Design a binder for this molecule. Structure first.
Ligand SMILES: Nc1nc2c(ncn2[C@@H]2O[C@H](COP(=O)(O)OP(=O)(O)O)[C@@H](O)[C@H]2O)c(=O)[nH]1
Ligand SMILES: Nc1nc2c(ncn2[C@@H]2O[C@H](COP(=O)(O)OP(=O)(O)O)[C@@H](O)[C@H]2O)c(=O)[nH]1
Lengths: 407, 404
């Protein structure tokens, strides 16, 4: 029963979409009503031109906002020097080899993974919204390899069936980035598809020490952002588990190094909470465990070194902590503004209804005679009352969404 | 048989030559001194001639006991985790160095061959022998040794009967990863070596950090021979789709580095200076064979046999190299110093044989004068002649062990 914390975001996205669809209806049901009280000739000064323009203009806005919402997702970007393991991590999070990840696999560019509803994967390049079909991680690798023309820094969106890993179902986009030791100007290309990530992951190789280039990059990032969500995965941990003599000291030296980094060098986090961003893991091992667990075979011969379970736990710990983290942050970052933008539309749509109801009441009160005419004044006054009562119900739904998902 | 024995052969050949040198020169200085101090001869042998035999006397022991300590040193460099300690160990057939002590500490580490049955540790500054039996006790004691500070090198002594290389007078040296303050530190503490090996991590591209080091070494050095070990090659072979390429590119830059950048070899000999291996596979294959077990569970990736074939071919070529180079670098000057000394000693004798003749010939007084002068001519002649026999077999050494 994996209640993956990403579902908090799937839930919120569902809720704010439901409210916005009701709202599109409410303003179109409303525009149809303001279009009719305006066109009526036996009804003057009741519906103003400054109210008909907004009631059609909101109808336009809300359609486009619905489009923007239906696209929002969670975006996590990975970074680190070449062959640290970035592609091995991602594939392990997806329980299969989605991205290529050998030695010498093309690394010159960004590769994102994200889900499609079909059973056929596919691919997209820059400048072309053609969907280039992609049949397997093998032919994806052999294709990239042959592209000598493939631009440096460019973006390649992979679309992988949501029914292969859960992570892709639950609206999460994962982004692999050019090796941070062979590019020099990666801090320039990050503005295209990575500066707006919710969570960044430094995939540090734990057979080494954190080189300045990796740290220098996150600097230039953290300079432009506001307390970004930075995780460090000292990957390849198994390497040092083959020699227990030094395991305590080796870890304590990395763990002190990463701790001092986030806490003191990046100042993005304090020590107490840093302990839930630095993990020691083995992507190659996690991916081997999973890619076998799905096929049916039991947990046999996956551990290349002793300590495999301790390591797997720490990874599952990372996935847990990270998932929770990205969904809380992204729900706020990507929805709190549309929520505020609806409270304003509602607040003015309904006071348009109040001014329509209020005029029609004062028309029947001081300027009305005909049985046929005053019977229109009552159906306009009742409809405006009914629609304004819809607005208040939507205002409550939004108060409720904000209460559940937006403290 | 091991191509190493050529160094051993020379060592014994020359070291006993220099014995006779200390023998000959002592007898000849005993005779110069007497003829000089003799008050009945005058200027048959000079004060200039006296002091020269005395210096030659006191210097020849020094050069002979320094001489006997000479050996072949091989140095390994490369950034942390590339496989240095692993390469060394594959060449000794055992895990004598531990891996994560280069990761905890930065120190040099040597393995010389002891004639004892149990290994032992020695640091700098002390003459305490910490004895070890298992590698684990070594790996532990290295860890606990608080004195293991930067640049401080520990000699590990490993029984000569446990590996031919240490038996055959070879010393191997690990070193801190070039990932630091090792710029001006290396000097004679590792630039004394005859061959430098560069252990490169195939997972990356050859980085400046390594080149930046060997280029700095190459400036204060002339024509040093260097091998590049592209280690961890199993990681490339696991991914065949990119493997031809990754190997081509590593060849290309390795080739360029030696031939063009470093100007240390030519394009045809560079071929036998670059290798694509997997140290850990070799250490496994050999630590398992050491106990007579068949080979099993050793391959890290398909092609293990080729990586093994390449490490064996590398070892042959390495031993051929450091056997020929080390005889020349460690001995030839001492040969030149020796043939210098003989030519100078044999002219000294002649100079008194002729002073003796020119007395016996142009100033004989009594039979007793004549008797004393003739003794000295035969004495000079007999010494003068043992110099020419030493000159001959000392040349006979060069023709056999310094061909040009
Ligand atoms: N032992 C071990 N090897 C790993 C681990 N993670 C990655 N690798 C290996 O590291 C090499 C580079 O990994 P890769 O996925 O390409 O990292 P990237 O180049 O930055 O994308 C590959 O040969 C993997 O097999 C790990 O946790 N343990
Ligand atoms: N897969 C693989 N691993 C290796 C190879 N050579 C060394 N290693 C591993 O690299 C890690 C660190 O290498 P090490 O031998 O300590 O090199 P050093 O740190 O520079 O002395 C060790 O855990 C080795 O097991 C190889 O050829 N293949």
């Amino acid at each position: 029963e994996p209640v993956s914390p990403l579902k908090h975001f799937v839930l919120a996205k569902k809720a704010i979409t439901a409210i916005f669809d009701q709202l599109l209806e409410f303003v179109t049901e409303g525009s149809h009503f303001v279009e009719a009280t305006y066109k009526n000739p036996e009804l003057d000064r009741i519906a103003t031109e400054d109210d008909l323009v907004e009631m059609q203009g909101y109808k336009d806005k809300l359609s486009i906002i619905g489009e923007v919402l239906s696209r929002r997702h969670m975006k996590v970007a990975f970074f680190g020097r070449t062959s640290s393991g970035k592609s091995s991590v991602i594939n392990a999070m997806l329980w299969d080899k989605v991205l290529p990840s050998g030695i010498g696999h093309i690394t010159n560019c960004f590769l994102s993974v994200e889900g499609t509803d079909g059973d056929k994967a596919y691919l997209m390049t820059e400048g072309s919204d053609e969907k280039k079909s992609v049949k397997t991680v093998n032919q994806l690798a052999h294709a990239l390899h042959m592209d000598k023309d493939l631009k440096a820094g460019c973006l390649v969106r992979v679309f992988w069936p949501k029914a292969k890993c859960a992570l892709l179902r639950d609206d999460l986009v994962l982004v692999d980035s050019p090796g941070t030791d062979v590019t020099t100007e990666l801090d320039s290309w990050i503005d295209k598809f990575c500066l707006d990530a919710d969570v960044f992951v430094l995939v540090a190789n734990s057979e080494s020490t954190l080189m300045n280039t990796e740290k220098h990059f996150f600097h230039k990032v953290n300079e432009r952002l506001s307390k970004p969500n930075i995780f460090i995965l000292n990957n390849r941990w198994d390497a040092s588990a083959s020699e227990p003599e030094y395991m305590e000291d080796v870890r304590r030296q990395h763990m002190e190094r990463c701790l001092h980094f986030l806490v003191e060098e990046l100042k993005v986090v304090n020590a107490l909470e840093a302990q839930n961003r630095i993990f020691f893991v083995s992507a190659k091992e996690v991916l081997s465990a999973r890619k076998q667990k799905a096929q049916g075979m039991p947990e046999s011969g996956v551990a290349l070194a002793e300590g495999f379970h301790a390591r797997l736990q720490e990874f599952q710990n990372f996935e847990q902590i990270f998932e929770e983290c990205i969904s809380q942050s992204a729900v706020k970052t990507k929805f709190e503004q549309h929520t505020i933008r609806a409270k304003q539309i509602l607040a003015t749509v309904k006071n348009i209804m109040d001014s329509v109801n209020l005029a029609a009441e004062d028309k029947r009160h001081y300027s009305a005679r005909l049985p046929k005419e005053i019977d229109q004044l009552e159906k306009i006054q009742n409809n405006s009352k009914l629609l304004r009562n819809k607005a208040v119900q939507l205002e409550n739904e939004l108060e409720n969404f904000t209460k559940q998902f937006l403290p």
